[PDB]
Amino acid sequence: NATEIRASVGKMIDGIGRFYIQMCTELKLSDYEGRLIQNSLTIERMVLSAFDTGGPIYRRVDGKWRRELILYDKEEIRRIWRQANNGDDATAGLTHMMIWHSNLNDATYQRTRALVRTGMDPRMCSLMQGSTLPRRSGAAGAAVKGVGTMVMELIRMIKRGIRRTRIAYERMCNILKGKFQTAAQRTMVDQVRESRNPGNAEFEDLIFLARSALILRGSVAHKSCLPACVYGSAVASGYDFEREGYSLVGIDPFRLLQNSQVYSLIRPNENPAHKSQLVWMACHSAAFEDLRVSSFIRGTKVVPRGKLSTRGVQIASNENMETMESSTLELRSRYWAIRTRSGGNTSGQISIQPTFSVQRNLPFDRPTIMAASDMRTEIIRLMESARPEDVSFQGRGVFELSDEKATSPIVPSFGSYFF
Amino acid sequence: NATEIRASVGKMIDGIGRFYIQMCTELKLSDYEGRLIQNSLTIERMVLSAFDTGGPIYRRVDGKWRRELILYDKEEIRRIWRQANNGDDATAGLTHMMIWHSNLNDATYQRTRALVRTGMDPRMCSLMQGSTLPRRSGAAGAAVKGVGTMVMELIRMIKRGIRRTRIAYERMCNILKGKFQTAAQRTMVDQVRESRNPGNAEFEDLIFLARSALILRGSVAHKSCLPACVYGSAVASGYDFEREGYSLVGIDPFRLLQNSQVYSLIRPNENPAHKSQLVWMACHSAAFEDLRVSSFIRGTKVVPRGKLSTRGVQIASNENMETMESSTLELRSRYWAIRTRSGGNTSGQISIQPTFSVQRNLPFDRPTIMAASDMRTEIIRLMESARPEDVSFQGRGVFELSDEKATSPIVPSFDMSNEGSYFF
Amino acid sequence: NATEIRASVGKMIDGIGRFYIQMCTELKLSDYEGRLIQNSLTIERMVLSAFDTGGPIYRRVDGKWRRELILYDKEEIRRIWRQANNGDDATAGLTHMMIWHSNLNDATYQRTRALVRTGMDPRMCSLMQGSTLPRRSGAAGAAVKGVGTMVMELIRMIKRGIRRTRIAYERMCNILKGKFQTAAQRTMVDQVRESRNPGNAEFEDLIFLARSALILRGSVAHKSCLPACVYGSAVASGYDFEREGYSLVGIDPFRLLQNSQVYSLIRPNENPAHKSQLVWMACHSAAFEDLRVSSFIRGTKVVPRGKLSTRGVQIASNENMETMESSTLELRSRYWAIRTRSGGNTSGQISIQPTFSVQRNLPFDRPTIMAASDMRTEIIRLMESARPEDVSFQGRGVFELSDEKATSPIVPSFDMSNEGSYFF
Amino acid sequence: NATEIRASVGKMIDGIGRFYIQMCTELKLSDYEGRLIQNSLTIERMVLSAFDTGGPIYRRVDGKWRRELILYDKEEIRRIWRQANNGDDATAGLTHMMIWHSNLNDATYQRTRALVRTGMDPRMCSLMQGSTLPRRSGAAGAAVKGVGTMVMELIRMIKRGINRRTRIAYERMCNILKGKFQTAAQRTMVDQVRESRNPGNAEFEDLIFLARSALILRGSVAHKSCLPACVYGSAVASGYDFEREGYSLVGIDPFRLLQNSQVYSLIRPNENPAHKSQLVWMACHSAAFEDLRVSSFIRGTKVVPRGKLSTRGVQIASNENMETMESSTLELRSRYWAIRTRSGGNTSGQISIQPTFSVQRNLPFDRPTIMAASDMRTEIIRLMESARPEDVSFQGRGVFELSDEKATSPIVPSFDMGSYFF
Ligand SMILES: Cc1onc(-c2ccccc2)c1C(=O)N1CCN(c2ccc([N+](=O)[O-])cc2Cl)CC1
């Protein structure tokens, strides 16, 4: 069954790939051009639009980068998609690209103005993964949406509050409950769900739950979804994604990025290694991850959004094509890591006992040892019980790329906020 | 004409694949056994023997490998060849296999002892491409034979000066002449050929030309030819070779190896990666290629022959089976490159005039600027002029395995350290 | 006399500037018409014929452009020039405009016919700076000339020879001698100069000397000489050149261009960006400069002459003005850099003594050791000594346009894909 | 016998080490202070002087570096030396330290002023390894001296000739020099210089000529990794058995020993530490006139020319200010190790390539070997033209991983990471 998953995940990939090759045949792009992320993005944005068309395609002519603006029938694209997915409409593949896009968004744009607009805390952006994704996304879509995104969506509904949209509010309530780990938080979601007239109090509870999820974090899916051009390149190399299988959370995407080759258009003022960092973060869904953890896995320093030289991957219609040069996106990384759904809630040893007289801190597991009527106060009780020093994922590490089955972990010894 | 040569090579490869599949049925071989390079080798060796029989076939019982010799009527194997080839005799396909064998040989053994035996330098082995291959290889075989191989065959005929076979000597001289790129070298062959009774005079001219081929290199074809089991696997999978076409010199063999599965028997001391280096090199006619270039294409390091722990792919009759392990060969590569006939030999600006005080190198096309009666000493003059640091194949590059039409050349550099340059 | 060269340079620039303005008023040219490079060229071309008339002048009338072939008195323009320069002949100003035209030519035309007519290698176009420049140019004009230009002038004489024209030959031999950076090249020009009977040997020695100038590069002045409209537009804007000073190799021409406004007529098949690449290079004496370097200084890429879509700045009299349009030339750049006179030549240890048993070449300085003799062989050896990879102008880099004094250099780190640096 | 060598080389090391520990006990230096190269150098310079005394010893007191100036009887030191070398005078050990010193000199000082003084070419400094070594050095001393050093020494004698037992002294030095040359021709030329009964100006010219030839047709010259005594003393104090383990000057041992060692240097305020590190490291592996590209490779950081270094030189002058003197770690580790050779590398198996792939690159061949298609001066000249700076020597030799104890898998570099230290 783990082998079953890998087979249909792999067929999903094989499809996107096969599609992409067909778009590089139509458009008569060279292998270089097909590997331009900007081109990749337009092709992805075309097929997504086709199932809801065109956009900028970039050719290299006389050593310079030419933007053209192509158009196509949604009907032809929708057929090519089916052809490449072997008859099927294959909605998983569409969703995959949607998640890659959102991951790119989460890493490109700070969603602050949209947060105050909803009467939420502008500093909550770590909870916001998946915010630019549509509500017309799959089970996989909801998996990927962060607690914040969920809370914002339910607030939008309550704010519009002052039939069929009752289930829409209850289902989203459910999804949100499904994200919480603690008994208490889960019960609070029920009280908000069960409310027949969702007033201001319901709003406050959501704002309160949102805030709680900064400390008592939510279980949120992380998937490595790469630009279509990556997959198309792999398929064109003869790679059998169905027969080999593939996983979004394992080694596969890291392994695939080691030997891949993507190029980006880069604005004169911009620093390439930075445009590389942006894209890399998007690829492994790591915009609200520990910058220290990112830097470790990558093997160069991942630096905050305010330190980047990059104006953002996609290129504006009014921008000048004359100053536009391009370069390699450097997408390899020293190690790989499994990605988890969990936020990591806090037998085997809890403490140390010093053997050697040597300057150092002396570890112990503070939560586990420190285990020596309103829902709001119970949640408050736990948040004080937590300190930013508590270790989660005890006994988990990164791996050598040579470590195909993940047998020998590597734990690092280390602000660290991207935004 | 190009779209139909593909169609016919397609047809040829197809037959090998079909024949191999047929032999795998004939011999009731497991999926794993049919892909074992050693089994492939015997199957190939048998068809060639039947068209001038049996050989060893390896089977895993109880986990441990068991070899058993097998005998087949030469007439019966000939029948299977012709069936898998829709009736036609498919000599091209028998030649393809012969070349694969010749490529494997080139990569496995130094051709030193037979070199001193003829009158030639042991340090001429970079010129011995296809010295294992017979004269029973056609025009395809002639192309693949290197400058020194030719030279050796003419010296063997001369040293049998101790009619209808005169014209054989002429034809061979023409092939040899056809490989030289300087006219000076060609005029000298046109001074060996017409010599009606050749003895020491012509043998001295040939050694000189052979020696000259080390610097002013001849044009020798390189063809990627894979072991029959790979083609068999690709046929079994539903790749119609005849319809899709196939090139020996383009992406097709590289793409075929990326996605194939070939196993090999390994002796207890041997390193599987090193064995995988031997097969890879063989597949791509790369025995006498700059190791630095091989490595770059391959994506991992390609090391010299005397740093390799391999006795050779073949298993000799006396070998201990009980101690024999097997493993998957690493035949993949990071990039690909067109295989060439070329030897490399060499208006508008040829240099730069610095306008600005800016730190940089000042490029200039060195070999051209540097380019500025007896035929022997004419060659020497050109030889003295040649510098090993001069670049050839200007603008030609490697390609991504997705780059079918060779659109986007990647021009490498070899700063990523290696283990030599000469494989010998 | 540090700032004193700068004041007299700004004297000439004010000069040309005042002359352009006064000439616009007298041709009654609108401000847009006035800043047109084609009106600039004809106005420039008129003073120079006058001190040795007409040419086409262009107007926007009824929305489109109309050429009018106007004729003014040589004697009257000669008078206008004088009172623009406060009485003086001030021939320095005249030389300036000649150099500007030469740099445009140098960017515009491949001198391939011109080179072969002379029995020179057509591949010598890099050595050709100031080929269209007359002998009637100053010592300013002599400095700007390339090694190959000088060799050509000398070959034309020796050829014309198959009194006081002898002192002419000898003068040119000395001009050339001073461009040479090595003592061997210098001595060899002196053997040419001292020749009792200038014939074939001297032709052969010059050809050899030109060839050596490709690797062992001559020293050639690069001066940034801009169109007269550019200077006239700053002097129209009350900018005081005699006050502020001016350099031809300093920041000032880059500074002037960033603030400047220059238009050009563009044919409907012509790319505006390509026309403006050409003018830009001519503005900075940059025809034979490494494209990598030119590109880095400008920001936007500088392509080879064969990828450009322009047939020149001047318009042929048979060309139709109805389909003719015009736009603003991109004369700006991302950075600025100093212009050298030098062509970058590349005590203490002269050899290595190996410590480690490691595979490598064992460097030694072959010219210097072997120098312990015929002049050709001394030169060949120094040429063989040089590699295209050798770095020149160590420590020297480009500056931010704000950075007015040369305080903080930017040393560029140049691409792995490094071929195609030659504009012709 | 290879095992025999390692045993007595090892005993030699063990001795220096044991001696050094005894000097750190007397002087009551802390483990830190004993690992100061400057202290190491004074201790070494003391025992060398004793057998021909004192000098500056640096203590760390209240966080600052104090120079004192100690004195001792040559008699006491000479006894400590014998005690540590277990009765023996053990002259090998003395010579070892002398070579480390010369190696340090060859990397510190350019010997140019001393070259013109001898009427030799000021650009010959690559031939000058061992020049500051005394003529009172062993067989090991002579091994280590470069052709130039030898030529300079014979010129000094000829120059004194125009102003008995010094006849053998001139002939033996002649012999040593002949022993360094590889080519038949160069060896014969040395004989003509030896056999001359009245060594005039012509003899001088021949030596000058031979010296110059040895820039291209290089001399066989020994390279030995001789480390500061403190390195050894530290190893011996760690309980390490140099006799039982054995040791080699040209193999992995010195690289292996520097990987886990720890030396500190006093560093002048203006100076860059990583540079002082480079100086010492070069000295340690005898690599002052080696290919800077080769050095940089083996080390794993860039080794940069003598004119790019921030360093004023290891030993500290009496008049220098102790107040601005800070100190740091000498970083002496290296990415790889390499065998050191005696040879200069004179130019079966393949001589050329045959391109398989259409790819931009140079196409190698072995120029000398292929180009093999009555005065001694002209014969030598014939060969120097026959040579080009591109000729590869040491075909099929490489560096090794430190993990590669027996040297089984080589690594050949491709050079782009001049290349002359001076
Ligand atoms: C092109 C290309 O497109 N897809 C791949 C690829 C795709 C999935 C997994 C691995 C490689 C790929 C590729 O270039 N490689 C990487 C180099 N490569 C390789 C991969 C793995 C190993 N290895 O870890 O033993 C050794 C090698 Cl030489 C062959 C496949």
Author numbering:
A (entry chain D): 21 to 72, 92 to 201, 213 to 396, 403 to 428, 438 to 479, 485 to 489
B (entry chain C), C (entry chain F): 21 to 72, 92 to 201, 213 to 396, 403 to 428, 438 to 489
D (entry chain A): 21 to 72, 92 to 202, 213 to 396, 403 to 428, 438 to 481, 485 to 489
Give sentences copied directly from the paper behind this entry.
In total, the genome of influenza A virus encodes eleven proteins, i.e. haemagglutinin (HA), neuraminidase (NA), nucleoprotein (NP), matrix protein (M1 and M2), non-structure proteins (NS1 and NS2) and polymerase (PA, PB1, PB1- F2 and PB2). Among them, NP is regarded as an attractive target due to its highly conservative and multifunctional nature during virus life cycle. Interestingly, Kao et al. identified NP as an anti-influenza drug target using advanced chemical genetics approach, and reported that a novel small molecule named nucleozin could target this protein. NP forms large aggregates in the presence of nucleozin, and is restrained from nuclear accumulation, which in turn results in cessation of virus replication.
The crystal structure of nucleozin bound H1N1 NP has been solved at a resolution of 3.0 Å and there are six NP molecules assembled into two trimers in the crystallographic asymmetric unit. In the current structure, two nucleozin compounds were found to bridge the two trimers in the asymmetric unit forming a dimer of trimers. There are six NP molecules in the asymmetric unit while only two nucleozin molecules were identified in the structure. It is very clear that one nucleozin molecule bridges two NP molecules in two adjacent trimers, and the binding pockets are formed by combination of the Y289/N309 pocket from one NP molecule and R382 pocket from the other NP molecule. The Y289/N309 pocket is composed of hydrophobic interactions with side chains of residues Y289, F291, L306, R305 and N309. In this pocket, the aromatic ring of residue Y289 forms hydrophobic interactions with the phenyl ring part of nucleozin through π stacking. Residue N309 forms both hydrophobic and weak hydrogen bond interactions with the middle part of nucleozin. The R382 pocket, composed of residues R382 and R384, supports the nitro-phenyl moiety of nucleozin like a horse saddle. In the NP-nucleozin complex structure, nucleozin molecules only bind with Y289/N309 pockets from Chain A and Chain D, and it has not been found in the other four Y289/N309 pockets and none of the Y52/Y313 pockets as revealed in the nucleozin analog-NP structure. The underlying reasons might be that, the interaction between nucleozin and Y289/N309 pocket is essential but not enough for their binding, so only these two Y289/N309 pockets in Chain A and D which get additional support from the R382 pocket in an adjacent NP chain are able to stabilize nucleozin molecules. Based on the structure, we propose that nucleozin could link two NP molecules into dimeric subunits, and then further induce the formation of large aggregates, which is illustrated in our computational models.
